[PDB]
Design an enzyme around this catalytic site. Sequence first.
Site, PDB file in Angstrom:
ATOM      1  N   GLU A 280       0.824  -1.214   0.000  1.00 40.95           N
ATOM      2  CA  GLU A 280       0.000   0.000   0.000  1.00 40.95           C
ATOM      3  C   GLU A 280       0.854   1.258   0.000  1.00 40.95           C
ATOM      4  O   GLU A 280       0.461   2.263  -0.603  1.00 40.95           O
ATOM      5  CB  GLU A 280      -0.985   0.096   1.176  1.00 40.95           C
ATOM      6  CG  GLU A 280      -2.131  -0.906   1.233  1.00 40.95           C
ATOM      7  CD  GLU A 280      -1.923  -1.989   2.263  1.00 40.95           C
ATOM      8  OE1 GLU A 280      -1.024  -1.823   3.110  1.00 40.95           O
ATOM      9  OE2 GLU A 280      -2.664  -2.991   2.237  1.00 40.95           O
ATOM     10  N   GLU A 283       1.762   1.689  -3.864  1.00 37.90           N
ATOM     11  CA  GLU A 283       0.775   2.355  -4.725  1.00 37.90           C
ATOM     12  C   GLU A 283       0.367   3.717  -4.181  1.00 37.90           C
ATOM     13  O   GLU A 283      -0.178   4.523  -4.935  1.00 37.90           O
ATOM     14  CB  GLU A 283      -0.503   1.558  -5.054  1.00 37.90           C
ATOM     15  CG  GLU A 283      -1.524   1.278  -3.980  1.00 37.90           C
ATOM     16  CD  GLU A 283      -1.212   0.050  -3.212  1.00 37.90           C
ATOM     17  OE1 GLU A 283      -0.069  -0.405  -3.326  1.00 37.90           O
ATOM     18  OE2 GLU A 283      -2.107  -0.472  -2.516  1.00 37.90           O
ATOM     19  N   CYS A 300      -8.545  -4.388   3.990  1.00 37.05           N
ATOM     20  CA  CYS A 300      -8.113  -5.317   5.027  1.00 37.05           C
ATOM     21  C   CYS A 300      -9.250  -6.231   5.461  1.00 37.05           C
ATOM     22  O   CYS A 300      -9.178  -7.453   5.302  1.00 37.05           O
ATOM     23  CB  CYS A 300      -7.578  -4.540   6.230  1.00 37.05           C
ATOM     24  SG  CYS A 300      -8.831  -3.543   7.052  1.00 37.05           S
ATOM     25  N   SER A 320      -8.472  -0.625  -2.625  1.00 34.94           N
ATOM     26  CA  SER A 320      -7.119  -1.090  -2.883  1.00 34.94           C
ATOM     27  C   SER A 320      -7.159  -2.437  -3.589  1.00 34.94           C
ATOM     28  O   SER A 320      -7.904  -3.337  -3.188  1.00 34.94           O
ATOM     29  CB  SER A 320      -6.338  -1.202  -1.576  1.00 34.94           C
ATOM     30  OG  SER A 320      -5.027  -1.686  -1.809  1.00 34.94           O
ATOM     31  N   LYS A 359     -14.480 -13.774   7.661  1.00 39.15           N
ATOM     32  CA  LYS A 359     -13.527 -14.573   6.908  1.00 39.15           C
ATOM     33  C   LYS A 359     -14.085 -15.944   6.545  1.00 39.15           C
ATOM     34  O   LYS A 359     -13.598 -16.567   5.597  1.00 39.15           O
ATOM     35  CB  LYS A 359     -12.244 -14.711   7.715  1.00 39.15           C
ATOM     36  CG  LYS A 359     -11.243 -13.622   7.413  1.00 39.15           C
ATOM     37  CD  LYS A 359     -10.163 -13.603   8.465  1.00 39.15           C
ATOM     38  CE  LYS A 359      -9.254 -12.393   8.347  1.00 39.15           C
ATOM     39  NZ  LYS A 359     -10.022 -11.124   8.429  1.00 39.15           N
ATOM     40  N   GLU A 362     -15.379 -15.081   3.440  1.00 40.67           N
ATOM     41  CA  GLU A 362     -14.294 -14.615   2.584  1.00 40.67           C
ATOM     42  C   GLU A 362     -13.547 -15.780   1.945  1.00 40.67           C
ATOM     43  O   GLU A 362     -13.201 -15.733   0.760  1.00 40.67           O
ATOM     44  CB  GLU A 362     -13.349 -13.732   3.399  1.00 40.67           C
ATOM     45  CG  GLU A 362     -12.191 -13.129   2.635  1.00 40.67           C
ATOM     46  CD  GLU A 362     -10.902 -13.899   2.831  1.00 40.67           C
ATOM     47  OE1 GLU A 362     -10.941 -14.977   3.460  1.00 40.67           O
ATOM     48  OE2 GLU A 362      -9.847 -13.413   2.373  1.00 40.67           O
ATOM     49  N   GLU A 367     -12.850 -16.155  -6.173  1.00 38.83           N
ATOM     50  CA  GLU A 367     -11.747 -15.458  -6.821  1.00 38.83           C
ATOM     51  C   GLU A 367     -10.500 -15.336  -5.958  1.00 38.83           C
ATOM     52  O   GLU A 367      -9.465 -14.890  -6.464  1.00 38.83           O
ATOM     53  CB  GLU A 367     -12.196 -14.063  -7.271  1.00 38.83           C
ATOM     54  CG  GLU A 367     -13.097 -14.056  -8.504  1.00 38.83           C
ATOM     55  CD  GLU A 367     -12.500 -14.788  -9.702  1.00 38.83           C
ATOM     56  OE1 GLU A 367     -11.260 -14.792  -9.861  1.00 38.83           O
ATOM     57  OE2 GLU A 367     -13.280 -15.366 -10.488  1.00 38.83           O
ATOM     58  N   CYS A 506     -10.306  -5.009  15.911  1.00 39.72           N
ATOM     59  CA  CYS A 506     -10.456  -6.460  15.952  1.00 39.72           C
ATOM     60  C   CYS A 506     -10.402  -7.040  17.358  1.00 39.72           C
ATOM     61  O   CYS A 506     -10.798  -8.196  17.544  1.00 39.72           O
ATOM     62  CB  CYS A 506      -9.394  -7.119  15.081  1.00 39.72           C
ATOM     63  SG  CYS A 506      -9.304  -6.457  13.412  1.00 39.72           S
TER      64      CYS A 506
HETATM   65  S1  SF4 Z   1     -12.575  -4.855  13.452  1.00 44.14           S
HETATM   66 FE1  SF4 Z   1     -14.152  -6.276  12.593  1.00 44.14          FE
HETATM   67  S2  SF4 Z   1     -14.223  -5.736  10.384  1.00 44.14           S
HETATM   68 FE2  SF4 Z   1     -12.265  -4.847  11.203  1.00 44.14          FE
HETATM   69  S3  SF4 Z   1     -10.719  -6.455  10.818  1.00 44.14           S
HETATM   70 FE3  SF4 Z   1     -11.477  -6.767  12.928  1.00 44.14          FE
HETATM   71  S4  SF4 Z   1     -13.131  -8.318  12.673  1.00 44.14           S
HETATM   72 FE4  SF4 Z   1     -12.745  -7.464  10.592  1.00 44.14          FE
END
Ligand code: SF4
Lengths: 583, 129, 470
Positions: A280, A283, A300, A320, A359, A362, A367, A506
């Site tokens: 990051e 770029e 992220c 990004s 996740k 995710e 992809e 987090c």
């Molecule tokens: S605060 Fe919530 S949305 Fe942000 S990285 Fe952590 S778990 Fe994911």
Amino acid sequence: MKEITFKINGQEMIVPEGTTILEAARMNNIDIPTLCYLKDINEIGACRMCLVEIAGARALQAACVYPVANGIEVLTNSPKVREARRVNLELILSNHNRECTTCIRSENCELQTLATDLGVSDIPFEGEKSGKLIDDLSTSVVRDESKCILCKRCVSVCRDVQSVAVLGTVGRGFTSQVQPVFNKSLADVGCINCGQCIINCPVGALKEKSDIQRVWDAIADPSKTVIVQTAPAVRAALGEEFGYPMGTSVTGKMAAALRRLGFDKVFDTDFGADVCIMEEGTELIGRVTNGGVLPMITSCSPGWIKFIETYYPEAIPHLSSCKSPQNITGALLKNHYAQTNNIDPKDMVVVSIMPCTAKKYEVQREELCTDGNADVDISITTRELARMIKEARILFNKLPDEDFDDYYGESTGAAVIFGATGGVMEAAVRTVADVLNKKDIQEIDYQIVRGVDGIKKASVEVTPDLTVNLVVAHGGANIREVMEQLKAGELADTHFIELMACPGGCVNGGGQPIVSAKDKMDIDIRTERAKALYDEDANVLTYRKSHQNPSVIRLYEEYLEEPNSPKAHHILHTKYSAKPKLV
Amino acid sequence: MAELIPVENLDVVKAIVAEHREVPGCLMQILQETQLKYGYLPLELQGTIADELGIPLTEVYGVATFYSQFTLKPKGKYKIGICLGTACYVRGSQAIIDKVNSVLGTQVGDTTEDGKWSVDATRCVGACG
Amino acid sequence: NIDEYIGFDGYLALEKVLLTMSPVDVINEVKASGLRGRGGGGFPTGLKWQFAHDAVSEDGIKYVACNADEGDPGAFMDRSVLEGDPHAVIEAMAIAGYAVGASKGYVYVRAEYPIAVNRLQIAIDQAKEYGILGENIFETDFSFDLEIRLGAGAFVCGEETALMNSIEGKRGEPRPRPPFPANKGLFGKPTVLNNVETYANIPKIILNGAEWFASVGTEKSKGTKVFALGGKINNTGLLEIPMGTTLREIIYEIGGGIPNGKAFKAAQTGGPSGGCLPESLLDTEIDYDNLIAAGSMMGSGGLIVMDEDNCMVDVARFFLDFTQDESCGKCPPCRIGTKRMLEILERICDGKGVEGDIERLEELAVGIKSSALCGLGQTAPNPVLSTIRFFRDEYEAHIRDKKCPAGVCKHLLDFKINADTCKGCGICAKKCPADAISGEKKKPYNIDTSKCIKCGACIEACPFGSISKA
Ligand code: SF4
Ligand SMILES: Cc1cc2nc3c(=O)[nH]c(=O)nc-3n(C[C@H](O)[C@H](O)[C@H](O)COP(=O)(O)O)c2cc1C
Ligand code: SF4
Ligand code: SF4
Ligand code: SF4
Ligand code: SF4
Ligand code: SF4
Ligand code: SF4
Ligand code: FES
Ligand code: FES
Ligand SMILES: [Zn+2]
């Protein structure tokens, strides 16, 4: 500010206007039961647990939402109060499926603690519970309707805190149930996999998608070698599971325990995290020198980028192109480590202990694969790792400490601060300043916007020719506000905006262990987790900057050349597409 | 009697939204007015009206379901509502209920397959004399 | 017709009040009148006017509301004054707005009364044509505005806080008190809630004086009260009698007696929120304090009279069926306790119950009485508690002896033919679906009670009416 005088149970107090009797008694060392009450989130009076006798009152009043008044008398231990509490618990318990051996919550179901506390042995009244409809179809959240108490905490959280509101109430009497719109499944609508709804429920009506069977199947394969990787925020709250006080670091104990499970390699997501910080930054340099799309935002957390895809596609040039630090290190292990070890990439299985529950969705994305091969296989949350350790059942409190593996376990403090909010952005600006102007900054002053807490603004001179505008955002409502301002276009001068859906960073994620309400009225768990993480940051005596780590320098020199190379773009850069909405 | 507007015609819905947007607490009024024009209100009408309002579907769907007088499924040509009031009850209205069930060949709360007869348990129409 | 009401000394109250009477004096007059609300809350009207008047709002905006949302079965007086004379109705809130300083009001009516809704808006046009509705009312500085809100006959919406959210457009779900709606109500502003019937006598208070209203009636409640008399009665209609008239007079002197010379057994007051009044209290003075001591209230003003032929077990189920249907559904008492109330009763009706369940009923009934947020559920078991208090021995017939003396409980009664009258034609055998009826022609048949489901197709199938309920 108005002063109110009130007399309860032998003691008189002066309080400001707007005071409630509940937290007034909390301050005066008296406790009253709570089910539907959350501090400043859900104050409606539906629990009907907290009854107290009021002088001059025809019947009882609920202390949870009861405003204080001048000159009143309150007594909290009448026989009527006890009988009303007993009968009302008998009534409410006739619905909740009483097989409490198999609830996930089990030991810390607040309903169970109330049931034991009131000592109500018998249940004279039978009943016919509402329809059992297991919604075992979505990707992350599983709902069970045989348990729900109509606490209304989940709907209030998903409406106010997250500004999504895909849950509502339907019907009347027994037909009244909490459901998504159109009688569909959770995954069929615009759910963001916030994780707040699953963490705040005081009963266990909601649970997360369990993949521990797949984990045990994978580890059972001798032909498959396992690569486990850890978050910086797993040691932030896991000790709370074992009765440890808030703020204990068990990192070496964690490594030892994971080695006792027989995992082939233990590793940290930190190395790829430093790689993407360099990314990051690169770029950033490019978009400065080429007039790239501005303002810039990260990629992220899966949750809010899912939200952007679902609701506001118009900002898709602003994202990004980099893939997530989980995805970066997963692809790195599946390619470069495989090349060095000369092992078929399908012969590795990679498992991640992350605190986001988004996740789970995710990894299911089509992809996020390299060369048609899965970058990571199984993602698990902190709670279910804790239950995996419990079923293995090693006495955790006497483990010694162990170190991590070469090369991708090494750590830096600016990458330690990923757990708190804005640490990624702090590391990014520190590294780009070091690269471009040799500027040595440790912290950034933040402008607290008046009227909105949780939004943070900053602007520090990165170079005398370029001062970069900095914005930090955590909380779905704050995301909605800043996105509306971005659509309004008043943030044209702004350069970085950092976003996560989960408020507070987090450490306050959906995968973090369940806590009750009592400690939440006492102490902010976010505050203690952040203090523990920052103390861990201050003790990192190897490097406070990512670009100085010899390991990332080695990898860049030998295999990654420079960032924004064609190989770097092909392996670590990805595009996103808007998802269809069913709202 | 004005003909019911086909439910796929959505320009009328947004015209109603635009003309009654300014009214405070307009959700219930718009809901009953579209109930009057359309006859029954399927789910895509909540979807469209909430998209025009830009406010999520949860409260709209709830207030659609919380009012029992609002219908989501097509009904018959004629609705028969028998007074379940106390003055009608003491006369022995359950005999009339069973006789209606016998003659109609349909249980209470169901629309005949011909789309002509429907029965409802209206608690009062007010003519208890 | 606007010319009709002005020809009967109409709209003269505003003419006097807007020129001679101060807003504070009006509250003094109604307080001197001893007026207390008939809506069911039992609150003194003039006392309510104090709390709205002295309260302070941020923007200097106050609101008033008119409650026309009647939902009590058998009660129809609320629309009747609206469809009888809405000109007197709209005149009342004009005095109310002056007393409080509210420049805009709201009126709430059910949409299933087309004659009522159409009539009121015509009166709205007539008033604003003469200048009554709008600005500079009768060349004064007072401006008052009204807006029609179309309700949809939700019974639970009849609560004070419940209707406020319906006007706000959210779910009709009740709110805990305090704060009272007089302090924080519509848009968080002070509000006044009064039903139409108490609005009706307001011009008479100003025109004829409070002493005239006080000159009739007892000390705690003065004046007259109206009820929608109904039930097992020869004559149906409305009566306007003062409080303290004994229950015996209205049944006999006014009602004309029980139809068909049947035996009076119990009487319903206050609708589903009230209770049963038997023959032991035919001499009871009807007013506020006596009836609540007898376990009932005015409710919305419903009066239903029962006879000997009705089994009180079934009517107790019937009133209870109302409460389960109209529950809003937050608090566990009004949501779960109603089927807990329910589930016991039909087993008693079907004979599946056991001894001691009557005591089980009272155990939870007192508990939910003291722990209900919504006002509806708190009054739910009052019909049931009324029955058990005076008609306890009827249940002993059902729980123990397994008979319905009134012949109503279908699964507990039996069928016997009158052999002296029965021709034995066998038509009932042809109309017996469970094949319980057997016998020979010209001779009365024989029936197996254990075979039939007690459907009752046979009793009407007899051309001579010889089948009797046993
Ligand atoms: S605060 Fe919530 S949305 Fe942000 S990285 Fe952590 S778990 Fe994911
Ligand atoms: C569930 C419920 C329904 C009610 N329905 C009515 C009604 O239909 N008509 C009415 O006049 N009052 C009703 N009330 C009473 C009103 O709350 C209110 O008390 C009345 O308008 C004011 O008169 P009061 O002075 O006696 O309170 C109801 C109350 C509750 C809790
Ligand atoms: S609510 Fe769930 S976890 Fe709590 S006791 Fe009941 S079954 Fe067990
Ligand atoms: S999950 Fe169930 S019990 Fe928990 S807040 Fe939601 S409705 Fe209430
Ligand atoms: S995951 Fe997020 S969006 Fe989905 S129900 Fe929970 S809080 Fe709401
Ligand atoms: S009595 Fe309780 S359950 Fe019934 S409407 Fe009122 S608050 Fe809701
Ligand atoms: S009650 Fe019905 S089933 Fe029983 S004998 Fe009579 S007709 Fe036959
Ligand atoms: S009861 Fe009536 S229908 Fe039956 S055999 Fe006798 S006369 Fe005939
Ligand atoms: S705990 Fe007091 S009302 Fe919920
Ligand atoms: S009593 Fe006949 S409709 Fe109510
Ligand atoms: Zn009976």
